[PDB]
Structure formats: C-alpha cells, structure tokens
Ligand binder design. Structure first.
Ligand SMILES: Nc1nc2c(ncn2[C@@H]2O[C@H](COP(=O)(O)OP(=O)(O)OP(=O)(O)O)[C@@H](O)[C@H]2O)c(=O)[nH]1
Ligand SMILES: Nc1nc2c(ncn2[C@@H]2O[C@H](COP(=O)(O)OP(=O)(O)O)[C@@H](O)[C@H]2O)c(=O)[nH]1
Ligand SMILES: [Mg+2]
Lengths: 421, 155, 428
C-alpha cells in the first residue's frame, strides 16, 4: 500500500485540489519546481504516497470541461509542478448541469481522462487507490466526477475509492439546481466510494462568518478551512505511523456498514488567513465541524483523532479517555474501543499545535435531510427538469436518487436508535 | 394555437414574440397540460419584463396550476426577488397554500432565499401556516439549523 | 539434534521474535553475526564456518517490519531467505490474511520452512509467534497452522499469542480477528501461551516505572518470559525436555490448552542495588495477580496443572520447602482428577538482561506455568466485544468481501461458546 492517484474535477475540485498540493508540498519540503529543500528525514519517508520521483511530481490528474480552470491552476504558486500531460480539459463546460457532466460533454472526455489514469496506475508498485476532489453542486465535478468514479471502480475494483466532496449551500452560491446535482451525485457516492469526507459549504461559511468574523467570506476563506482539513485527514497516510496508515486500514476502522461511509471532519484551532485539553474539546465541538451537523444530535459509530506537534502523549491519552467517559451517551456502546488516536510530531504550517477529527456520526443525516428537503421542494414543482431530460437523462433517475438518499437517512436513524441490550 | 406559443415565449423569455402573439389575440391566461399559465412560466424562468407585460394585460396573478402552485410560490421557490415584489404589488396572495400545504414563505425558507423571506414577512406572510407535515417556516429553520433564517423569521 | 523451528508472523510476531533471538544470543554467548569465541543446537544450526544460525522464519504480508530486521543489528544473524515479505498487508482483516492476500505467499513460506526442516535430524516441531488482533497475525497464522498440520502430522505446534489491549490497539475489529483465529487454530495447536498486552503494559507501568510503554519495552519483558518457557529446550533441561512434554505436563485435554504464565521478580534497572529475593519470596510472587501474563483471577478458578521453572542461584531443597508452604494455601485448588502437585525445573544459569533493557539483573527468577480455569475470563471478555459488534453485523462486510462466508462468524463464535463450557465443566 503505497501510491495514491489524485484526481481533481471541475472548478471547485481543481481549486481545492491546487490548495491541497501547495499545503502538503510545503509540509514535505517540495518547492514549486519539484525540488526537495526540507530539513527532516520524516518528510521524504512516505513521499511516494503522493509524488512520483522524476525531482518530485504530484500523482495528480486535473480534469475540467471548462478550459479556463487549466490556466487558473497553472498561474497558481505550484501550477508548473503538475505533469503537463495530466491536464485533461474540454472546450464547452457543463453549465452547472449534472446531466451534461455525466452523459454528454463529460462522456465525450471520460476516455481521455481514463487513458491518463491508466498510465499513472501501471507505473505504481502497490497502488492503494484513488482520491477525488470535487463539488456536488456543479455539473463537471458532480456529473463527470461520479462518471469517473463509476468507470474507475469497474476497472480497479480491488482499489480504495476515496473522495473529498464539497456539499452545496444557498449561503455560498444559491443556484437552485444544486440540490438536484448533489442528490444525483450522493446516489453514486453511496454505491461506488469506500470513504467520503463531507466538506459542507454551509459549515465553511458559518465558521468564517460567525467564528472568524469575516463579514463577506470568499472562496479563499472557505478553502483555507478545506486545505487545513485535507492536510489533517491525510497526515496518517503521509508520515510514518501505525494507525490508519493507508486507505484500507482507515476504511476498516471507520466504516462498520458499507453505505455509511460519509465522514464529518473537524479541526482545531480554527483560524483565518492552544493546550491539549483545548485542542481536544474544540476538535469535538459542533462549531469546529466541516459538515453542518450537530454531533450531539446523533451518535458516533467510529472516530479517528490526529494530534500534530510536540506534546505530552499521557495528556493526549487522559483527555481522549475523558471525552469518551464524560460523553459516553454520544458513542455507540455496541462498537467497543471505537475512538482511535494518532500523534504526528510534524505540525501544520503556521502552528505549533493542531488536532484533526474524523467522525463517522449518525448526525450526518442532518446534512442529507437538508439537501433532500431542497431537492424535494424543487422536484415537486418539476422545476427545470427539461434541462436534465434533454441531456440524455430520464425523470425516473430523479425519483430513484431521491429514494436512495432518503434510504441513506433512514439507515443512519436505525443505528442512532440501536441499543446493545 | 397562440396559447401554446405564448406559453413557450413566456418560458423562453422571448419579449418581442410575447408582444406579437398578444397582438394576434393570444390568450394571456392560457394553460399548459398541468395548468401553468404564461405568468407562472415567466415567474419561474425569471423574465421580469414578461411578468410585467402579462400583469398589465389581464393575467390572473393568483392563478393555480393542478398542484395549487401560484406564480408567487414559483418566484419564491426559484428566488426571483424583483418578480416576488412585482407579484405582491399586483395583489398576489402572500399566503396562498398549494397541494403540499406549502406557502411562498415555506418555499423561500427551504431554499434559503433570505431577502425574499423578509419581503414576504413584511407583506403579511403567516408565520403560523403549517404544511401537510405540521411544519411552519420557523419549524423548518429550527429543524435544519438555519440560524440566520430563524432570526429573520422571529422579527 | 531434537530441533525446534520458530515461526514469527506479522508485526507483533516479528518484533517479539527480534527481542527473543536477541536475548537467546546473549544467553548462549552468540554474537549478532552468529559467531562465538552444545545444548542450544536445538534452536541454532551450525554452518561449516562456525556460524550459529537461528532455526527461524519471519513472515509478514508487508515489508516495513521485516525490512528493519534486514538492516538492523541482527542483519547477519538469520538466513536471509527466512525473512519473507509480501507487499500489501491484511488491513486488520483476518479474511485477507487467511484468504485473498495470504494465499499469494503461503507456498513460498512452506517451501522455506521445508528447507529448515530438511536440516533437522529429529525435528520436534514449531513455536509460532503472532498477534490475535492483526490481519496477518490472525489469518495468515491460521492458514499456516492448517498447512503445517497436513505437512507435519506428527510434529508438535506451540503458540505465543498476543491477546489485544485497547491501550495499544490500532483496530476496532481485533475481537473478530481474535475469535476467528482461535476457532481455526484450536485443532492444530497443542499448547498456546497467551500474552495479554494490558497485563504487560501494567507491569511496565507499575514495576518498571515506564509512564508510556513502547512495543520495545513490552517486547523485552515478553522475551524474558518466552525465554523462561523455552530454556528447557535450549539448555538440555530435565523438565519439558521436548515439545511433547509441554502437552503432557500442561494440557490434560487437547482443547483446554491455554496455560497462564506468571513471572517474578520484575525489577527496574534503575534499582541496581536491590536486596535479593529468596526462593520462598519469588515462589510466593507466582500467586500474586500483578505478575500474571493474562488478566484473570486464579483464586476463583481451579488448577489442572502447575509447573515452576526456576532460573539462577536456586537450591532444590529451598524450592521444595517453598512448594510445601504453597500447598498449605486455601486459594490454590486443583481439579480432583489431576495429581495435586507442582512439577519443578531448575536452570542454574543467572537470568540474562539485555543491554538497552529496563530490567535489573537478579540472582534468581521463576516462571510459573499453570493451566487454570480462570483464564476462561480472558475468552469471556473477547467474546463479549465480539457479541456487541456481531449482533449489529458491524464490519462484517469487510470479511465477506475478502473470501470469507458470513457463516464462519457464527461457527467461530459457537466454538468459543463450547470452549467456555469446557472450562465451566472442568471446574465449578
Ligand atoms: N506486544 C506487542 N504487541 C504488538 C506489537 N505490534 C503489534 N502488536 C499488537 O498486535 C495487534 C495488531 O496486529 P499486528 O501484529 O500489528 O498486525 P499484523 O499481524 O502485522 O497484520 P496486518 O498489519 O493487519 O497485516 C494489536 O493488538 C497490537 O497492539 C509488538 O511489537 N508487541
Ligand atoms: N468550498 C468551495 N466551494 C466551491 C469552490 N468553487 C466552487 N464551489 C462550489 O461548487 C459548486 C459549483 O460547482 P463548480 O465546481 O463550480 O462546478 P463544476 O465546474 O461544474 O464542477 C457550488 O456549490 C459552489 O459553491 C471553491 O473554490 N471552494
Ligand atoms: Mg502488519
């Protein structure tokens, strides 16, 4: 289990993807030309996980139906680090239409993308699997991203499929077709991914506005929270360790039921562009969650907590046992020892102390119900269905997508009310 | 049939075709198979100038389709603020109730159209109106954790 | 000779193996390259050039742990072909270890074991080191044990098995792996020494004053106990002279083959001038729960066998007097069908401590091996965690998708339920 192949699709996928590469490159001492200029041996030990050694080159494929995003990424600080042949771009975008992404424009580009994936996978010694960054609210990332997921799963069934999926909110974009796009996508994520990090624009906006007191949050403000989260949740894959060291061991510890693989990430401290008990309480606080759900409204099936920086392990162990013993009623009693803790010595950029939380909580049903209520409000009035049905799609796909997401909500509620007895 | 052509021109935002069709006797209150009128379609698709033209020439501002949707429900659902305002200026029933028990306030609340919610409340939207599941717009805001909306709904 | 082959499976098995061979080398005067300026021939072959090579195999489904053996202090001790690695591990999944990943290296492992077995004139059998919790330690061990039973029908197989503790666990599914491996290995193992990581952790904290024990700390303590158990095999002892005699002395019936190990004295290396404990004192320490390798309460259970393995400056008459005192203690009850007695082994060499270790050198030490019904409490704890998850079928999909049928969970659990009844029937 060594190489991960990263795919970034659509505007959001590429923007959060570019930030992910900038952040982990600085952590691993890789400069914008691929040269290593760090001063720690731990930085290079597991560099093969995300980088090909040419000089280090990201094992990243950049996809979009809109060419403008090629230039945007290339113009960025680490833009020239990516392999030029790994940029697979179309001419006519998807216009926020899932059907254009999944069936028409996206279907025409998908084979050129799979050719590049194949080339990157055949060069891997022991391919762990795939990491996809995308939004669910648009057309490319959602429609073409889920098409790519389906085609990769059929060609690489033995590999782990992991996504960083950004959920739409009226607070950030407010284009009323986003609930359709997102519902049609969750349908695909439930069946074809092993693990999904739910990055909710509702939560990112609320953190920026209410906690960080940013009057008008930008995508840069939201993406600062996303990049800190992506760095945090991939620490165990990128540095030596014994807990959740690869995608499969992470899945086996975090996923008790195959469809309930949507994680609520959290991070402390929250900052705009700290002791061990503070890190521990903030990590578990609703205000620090990247999914707009209150964990105290459900129960934790499983949890992974990653602490970063120089700190007392006996203090981390005491504070972690304290939260479970104090708040016993929020962790399912029928999954014994369901909270696992890691500590990485290397801290993130600009901080001495940090903590990342990955929860598989039944409270994530609040996110799915919010999307479902918006989907249903729109679908009941059949608003703009023609835009989808005229792009190689059927109306029954809407009813099946609605039904699959409400069954997902029902499954979470089943385990929230379950008792050991 | 000019009725079908007017319905399509109102939906497509074809201002000059709406004008020519009306000049040839097109029924301003024509209905499609589901009971939607040119005003419902212009309101749904955000065509403010066509909304105004239809209302100046006898369009029923409170017409209902088969599901009980009025143009105001659809402008509130889609989030067309200026259209909501024109419709209310022309006598739109702020508390019209569709077949799901929804009022324009419920739809603007669900979709997070906060400015529209404020206008509807200013024009007398019923905070006690319950949908078929017993939920008011305030219940929707509490149940979905929308704190900005819950504050707005409480003024 | 009367050779014994040691097999180390998965991270825990390999790392404990490293600590054991390190200690054996020091006990026998062997250097890390196999040279020395014999009784230990049971455990080491001798090449034409005077090199003493462990009769040992190390196997892991990923290379990280075995790569450290290949580049560390003992890089030249082992036969390089007896350090075997795959690329992709079992992901804490018994099914991957036993079925989908393990089946890719099993033939190589058996062919490499055969090469060691062909250098033996009178192979006694195998000592197998592994965790219960890991995918490899659980699944690959059970696959290997099944294959060794077919390929070496008359050879004894002894296990050193690491029982999981939440303080150092890396997987939620370790109770599943534990029960699955216990079910599938039970018929193929003649005697198994369980080591509860929580018991070892507590000893390190309470006796060695180590606030946060590492695997290196736990493993050097475990190796001291393993050495006490295997010393008879390596020093031509009068008790437990061969693998068959472990079964005769400790296992009255094939299934209840889990003896409890208790070891004393464990003293911190910072206490270099501690007053030495007598034979009576260290023997009394064998009935104190704090010194047990498995957390359980022998005072509530019944004994089916008991053997005392002494090391160092130990006079037989002092052992006999200490045993007579022990025999007049209300808390030691033997089953009515076994001779109510204690077998004795004495090895006169001073107990050895490793440079880099946490233990003080002592003049005399003892390891008691007792087959007590109290160890059933360790099975009951594992079975309870298994039942909580299995009732909701939590994590079962990971196993069914890796070459295992769902029916194997309930078959393994009912065999554990039959094991709990076996203990309850032997002593009440
Ligand atoms: N005492 C001790 N326990 C260990 C050691 N390494 C791991 N463990 C324990 O073994 C269990 C985990 O199994 P491992 O041996 O690491 O796993 P594995 O056999 O390599 O299997 P996979 O990695 O799943 O392929 C847990 O209960 C750990 O606490 C060690 O060196 N010493
Ligand atoms: N957090 C975040 N959300 C974004 C970003 N760019 C777009 N989005 C969201 O993504 C959705 C629109 O999809 P987008 O990626 O632009 O369309 P695509 O190019 O067709 O995949 C909406 O929910 C936007 O709010 C970004 O940089 N960060
Ligand atoms: Mg391992």
């Amino acid at each position: 289990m060594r190489e991960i192949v990263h795919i970034q699709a659509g505007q959001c996928g590429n923007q959060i993807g570019a930030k992910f590469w900038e952040v982990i490159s600085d952590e691993h001492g890789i400069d914008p030309t691929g040269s290593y200029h760090g001063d720690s041996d731990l930085q290079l030990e597991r560099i093969n996980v995300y980088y090909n050694e040419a000089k280090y080159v990201p094992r990243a494929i950049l996809v979009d139906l809109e060419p403008g995003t090629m230039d945007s990424v290339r113009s960025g600080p680490f833009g020239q680090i990516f392999r030029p042949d790994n940029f697979v771009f179309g001419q006519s975008g998807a216009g926020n239409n899932w059907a254009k992404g999944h069936y028409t424009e996206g279907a025409e580009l998908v084979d050129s993308v799979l050719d590049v994936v194949r080339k990157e996978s055949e060069s891997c010694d022991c391919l762990q699997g795939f990491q996809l960054t995308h939004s669910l609210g648009g057309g490319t990332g959602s429609g073409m991203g889920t098409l790519l997921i389906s085609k990769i799963r059929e060609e690489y069934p033995d590999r782990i499929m992991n996504t960083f999926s950004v959920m739409p909110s009226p607070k950030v974009s407010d284009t009323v077709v986003e609930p359709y796009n997102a519902t049609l996508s969750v349908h695909q994520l439930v069946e074809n991914t092993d693990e999904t990090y739910c990055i909710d624009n509702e939560a990112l906006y609320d953190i920026c506005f209410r906690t960080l007191k940013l009057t008008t949050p930008t995508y840069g403000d939201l993406n600062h929270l996303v990049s800190a989260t992506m760095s945090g949740v991939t620490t165990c894959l990128r540095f030596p360790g014994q807990l959740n060291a690869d995608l499969r061991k992470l899945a086996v510890n975090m996923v008790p039921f195959p469809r309930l693989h949507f994680f609520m990430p959290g991070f402390a401290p929250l900052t705009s562009r700290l002791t061990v008990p503070e890190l521990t309480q903030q990590m578990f606080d609703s205000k620090n969650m990247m999914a707009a759900c209150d964990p105290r409204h459900g129960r934790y099936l499983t949890v992974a907590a990653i602490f970063r920086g120089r700190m007392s392990m006996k203090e981390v162990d005491e504070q972690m046992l304290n939260v479970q013993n104090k708040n016993s009623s929020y962790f399912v009693e029928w999954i014994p020892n369901n909270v696992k803790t890691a500590v990485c010595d290397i801290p993130p950029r600009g901080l001495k102390m940090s903590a990342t939380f990955i929860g598989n909580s039944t409270a994530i049903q609040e996110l799915f119900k919010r999307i479902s209520e918006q989907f249903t409000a729109m679908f009941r009035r059949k608003a703009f269905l023609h835009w989808y049905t005229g792009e190689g799609m059927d109306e029954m796909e809407f009813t099946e997508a609605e039904s699959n997401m409400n069954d997902l909500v029902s499954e979470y509620q089943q385990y929230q009310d379950a008792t050991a007895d | 049939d000019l009725g079908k052509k007017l319905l399509e021109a109102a939906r497509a935002g074809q201002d000059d075709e709406v004008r020519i069709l009306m000049a040839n006797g097109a029924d301003v209150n024509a209905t499609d198979a589901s009971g939607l009128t040119p005003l419902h379609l212009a309101a749904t698709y955000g065509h403010l100038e066509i909304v105004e033209v239809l209302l100046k020439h006898g369009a029923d501002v409170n017409a209902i389709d088969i599901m009980g949707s009025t143009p105001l429900h659809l402008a509130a659902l889609i989030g067309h603020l200026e259209i909501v305002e024109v419709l209310l200026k022309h006598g739109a029933d702020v508390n019209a109730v569709d077949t799901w028990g929804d009022t324009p306030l419920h739809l603007a609340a669900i979709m997070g159209h906060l400015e529209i919610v404020e206008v509807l409340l200013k024009h007398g939207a019923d905070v006690n109106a319950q949908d078929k599941f017993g939920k008011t717009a305030f219940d929707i805001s509490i149940d979905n954790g929308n704190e900005d909306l819950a504050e707005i709904l409480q003024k | 000779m009367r050779e014994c082959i040691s097999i180390h499976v998965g991270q825990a098995g390999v790392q404990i193996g490293n600590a054991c061979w390190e200690l054996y080398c020091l006990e026998h005067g062997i250097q890390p390259d196999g040279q020395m300026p014999d009784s230990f021939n049971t455990f080491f072959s001798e090449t034409g050039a005077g090199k003493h090579v462990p009769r040992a195999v190390f196997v892991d489904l990923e290379p990280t742990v075995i790569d450290e053996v290949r580049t560390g202090t003992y890089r030249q001790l082992f036969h390089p072909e007896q350090l075997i690695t795959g690329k992709e591990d079992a992901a804490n999944n018994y099914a991957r270890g036993h079925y989908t990943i393990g089946k890719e290296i099993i033939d190589l492992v058996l062919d490499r074991i055969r090469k060691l077995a062909d250098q033996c004139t009178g192979l006694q059998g195998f000592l197998v080191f592994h965790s219960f919790g890991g995918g490899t330690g659980s699944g690959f061990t059970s696959l290997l044990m099944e294959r060794l039973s077919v390929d070496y029908g008359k050879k004894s197989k002894l296990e050193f098995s690491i029982y999981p503790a939440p303080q150092v666990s890396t997987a939620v599914v370790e109770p599943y792996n534990s029960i699955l491996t216990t079910h599938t290995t039970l018929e193929h193992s003649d005697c198994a020494f369980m080591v509860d990581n929580e018991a070892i952790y507590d000893i390190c904290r309470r006796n060695l004053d180590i606030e946060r024990p590492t695997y290196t700390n736990l493993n050097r303590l475990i190796s001291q106990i393993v050495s006490s158990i295997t010393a008879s095999l390596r020093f031509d002892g009068a008790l437990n002279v061969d693998l068959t005699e472990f079964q005769t002395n400790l296992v009255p019936y094939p299934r209840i083959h889990f003896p409890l190990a208790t070891y004393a004295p464990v003293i911190s290396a910072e206490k270099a001038y501690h007053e030495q404990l007598s034979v009576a004192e260290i023997t009394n320490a064998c009935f104190e729960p704090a010194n047990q390798m498995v957390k359980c309460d022998p005072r509530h259970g019944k004994y089916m066998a008991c053997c005392l393995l002494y090391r160092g400056d130990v006079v037989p008459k002092d052992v006999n007097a200490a045993i007579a005192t022990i025999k007049t203690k209300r808390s030691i009850q033997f089953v009515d069908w076994c001779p109510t007695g204690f077998k004795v082994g004495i090895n006169y060499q001073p107990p050895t401590v490793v440079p880099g270790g946490d233990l003080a050198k002592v003049q005399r030490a003892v390891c008691m091996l007792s087959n007590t019904t109290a160890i059933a409490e360790a099975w009951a704890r594992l079975d309870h965690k298994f039942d909580l998850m299995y009732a909701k079928r939590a994590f079962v999909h990971w196993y069914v998708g890796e070459g295992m049928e769902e029916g194997e969970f309930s078959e393994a659990r009912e065999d554990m339920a039959a094991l709990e009844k076996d203990y309850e029937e032997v002593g009440v």
